[PDB]
């Protein structure tokens, strides 16, 4: 009768309005499932963020007008390593030394920005991606290193992944080592009159072809890079995960304010669905 | 004709019982009609009671939200002040951290130097090797002018100086059997045979090799494998020469910047290096160090707890969140639930009105009454008197 009709008229008008009771509960179960799981991936990390404390860059933005998107970060967190190959991160850490926390900024000018109007808490090495120079190991190089050592060499920057958008600051980098088995496959590279390469000894000892040969008694700092990048993305993706439900469901109050009076009269109207169910137990 | 006697009897005796009852039936159909009257009355008290009990609910449950309110809003304002003193808090925690790597690496970094060497020499001095000279910076004199320019242009001059390409290895051995360091090592043989005459300087800055007064010349080429064209600009002439003239070259600023050939271009904050050459240090103390490492781990925890107790107070304003719609269901229940049972009240007390007054006129009409009174005594003597 007009009972289930007055209702059904306004039950009817909420959902062309576009509100829904059970969207937004099933929402909030996911939003306090996602506040907990940010909250319990970050607390799990804060341990190995204490070891990997030079990856940071603070800068104060030196102009208004100053493009931010002209620092690309910290070198540390600007390549990763594949599975595979995390045998080779001593190597790999050695090869790269100090450059590791170098910052790689756009061009020559945004460097010399930083350095002055930028307050740097403490010392910097910066490399301009339009200023730098080095002269690659060439093709035939790697190639008679190869045949020379058979499965024992390879060029370091072919150990690692990046976007070319930064290239020239591996390549500068990574580019010019030959990362080897042992040190009798060094020696005999690095010091061959065609191959005149650099040469890190997979226990992370170095032959310079200038005089050089490090060496001596010491998993470690390149691995825990390695894993705070995965961490600090897998946390990235959460606040983003997060962020679009939020969102979603922020949003889905104004439909729940035209509740203010759709529903604050449906409350008062599935009142008298049973008002005139109870007069119609007869008599 | 001729019927019995004691049959004679029951003929009426029965007639009576066909009034006897009828007069019980009208006595039932009588205490039925109070009963009504009474049971409604029992009804009309407990709704009477019931709807009591609701508006001691309400109040209740009124009293429970309209509080909850308060301690909503309240426990907010507390949460996000607190929040805030975490993020500084969390600042803060970092600053230390970054201090805490920074005093840890160079008094790691000094002591694998006051280690080596120590190492190094006892080495030596049983005859064990020969070649080993020591610290390039130890094997040649510059002017205290540039003490700073050349340590942070050339940390090279850590290296160690040695003849033999295996007497540097013979080193590393040593070294690792009994775990004391690591080194790295100019090798004086397979090191280029170098120019190093007086070059033509742009802008007419030095170069720093010139500085350099080697304590043998059977080191100077050593000296000029480190550093190299290295000119000594200051207050940054450098970012004009060299970036680019003709040649690119190698600058320090004299107060400790600098730009490599390659494109580097290296600045400070507050710590410049000094003492690699010839010409109370700024070192730490395993004490000083382990003190400094000792407080960080308090205010690191310090922070694991204020950290704690800001979650929870997310998790319990989580459950005001969802009792706010909980209580106000409920007091929406009741006041609906209220309201139906005073519809029923009002229709009850109609009702007791009715069967009320079908009470009094069964009581206030007597006719069928004394009619069935006479008949039970009219057949109560006819039996009598037959």
């Known amino acids: 009768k007009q009972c289930q009709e007055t209702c059904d008229k306004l039950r009817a008008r909420l959902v062309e309005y576009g509100f829904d009771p059970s969207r937004i509960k099933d929402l909030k179960q996911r939003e306090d499932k996602l506040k907990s799981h940010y909250y319990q991936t970050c607390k799990n990390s804060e341990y190995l963020k204490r070891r990997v404390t030079n990856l940071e860059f603070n800068y104060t933005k030196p102009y208004p007008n100053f493009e931010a998107s002209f620092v690309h970060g910290v070198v540390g967190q600007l390549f990763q390593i594949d599975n595979d190959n995390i045998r080779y991160a001593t190597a790999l850490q050695t090869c790269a030394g100090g450059r590791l926390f ?38 035939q190089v790697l190639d008679l290193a190869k045949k020379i050592a058979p499965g024992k060499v390879e060029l370091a920057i072919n150990l690692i992944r990046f976007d070319e958008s930064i290239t020239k600051a591996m390549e500068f980098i990574f580019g010019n080592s030959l990362i080897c088995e042992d040190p009798e ?10 191959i005149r390469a650099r040469s890190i000894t997979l226990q992370g000892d170095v032959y310079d072809p200038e005089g050089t040969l490090s060496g001596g008694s010491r998993e470690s700092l390149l691995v825990d890079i390695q894993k705070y990048n995965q961490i600090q993305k897998q946390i990235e993706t959460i606040q983003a995960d997060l962020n679009h439900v939020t969102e979603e469901l922020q949003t889905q109050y104004a439909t729940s304010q035209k509740t203010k009076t759709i529903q604050s009269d449906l409350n008062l109207s599935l009142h008298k669905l049973d008002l005139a169910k109870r007069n119609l137990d007869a008599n | 004709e001729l019927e019995p006697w004691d049959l004679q009897l029951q003929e009426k005796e029965s007639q009576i019982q066909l009034a006897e009852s009828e007069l019980s039936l009208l006595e039932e159909t009588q205490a039925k009609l109070k009963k009504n009257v009474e049971t409604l009355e029992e009804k009309i008290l407990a709704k009477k009671t019931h709807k009591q009990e609701l508006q001691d609910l309400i109040l209740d449950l009124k009293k429970k939200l309209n509080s909850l309110k308060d301690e909503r809003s309240q426990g907010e304002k507390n949460f996000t002040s607190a929040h805030l003193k975490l993020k500084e808090m969390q600042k803060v925690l970092n600053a230390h951290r970054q201090r805490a790597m920074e005093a840890r690496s160079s008094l790691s970094k000094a002591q694998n130097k006051s280690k080596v060497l120590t190492a190094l020499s006892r080495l030596q001095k049983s005859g064990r090797i020969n070649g080993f000279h020591g610290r390039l910076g130890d094997l040649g004199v510059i002017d205290d002018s540039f003490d700073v320019a050349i340590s942070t242009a050339c940390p090279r001059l850590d290296d160690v100086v040695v003849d033999t390409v295996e007497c540097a290895q013979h080193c590393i051995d040593y070294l690792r059997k009994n775990k004391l360091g690591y080194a790295r090592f100019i090798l004086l043989d397979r090191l280029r045979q170098f120019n190093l005459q007086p070059i033509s300087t742009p802008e007419n800055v030095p170069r720093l090799f010139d500085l350099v007064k080697p304590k043998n010349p059977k080191f100077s080429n050593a000296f000029y494998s480190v550093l190299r064209d290295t000119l000594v600009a200051q207050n940054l002439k450098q970012a004009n020469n060299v970036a680019y003239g003709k040649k690119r070259f190698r600058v320090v600023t004299v107060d400790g910047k600098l730009i490599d050939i390659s494109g580097t271009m290296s600045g400070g904050g507050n710590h410049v290096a000094k003492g690699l050459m010839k010409l109370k240090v700024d070192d730490y103390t395993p004490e000083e160090v382990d003190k400094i490492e000792r407080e960080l781990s308090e205010r690191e925890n310090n922070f694991r707890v204020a950290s704690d107790t800001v979650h929870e107070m997310e998790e319990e304003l989580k459950k005001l969140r969802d009792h706010e719609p909980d209580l106000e269901s409920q007091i929406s229940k009741a006041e609906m639930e209220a309201d139906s049972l005073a519809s029923e009240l009002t229709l009850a007390e109609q009702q007791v009105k009715e069967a009320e007054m079908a009470y009094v006129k069964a009581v206030s009409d007597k006719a069928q009454l004394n009619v069935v009174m006479k008949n039970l005594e009219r057949l109560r003597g006819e039996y009598n008197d037959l």
């Open chain 1, 102 to 139: 170098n910052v790689v900024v756009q061009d020559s000018q945004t460097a010399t920005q930083l350095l002055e109007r930028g307050r740097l808490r403490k010392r910097v090495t910066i490399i301009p991606l339009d200023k730098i120079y080095t002269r690659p190991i060439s093709s």
């Open chain 1, 185 to 194: 496959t060094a020696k005999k590279i690095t010091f061959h009159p065609k």
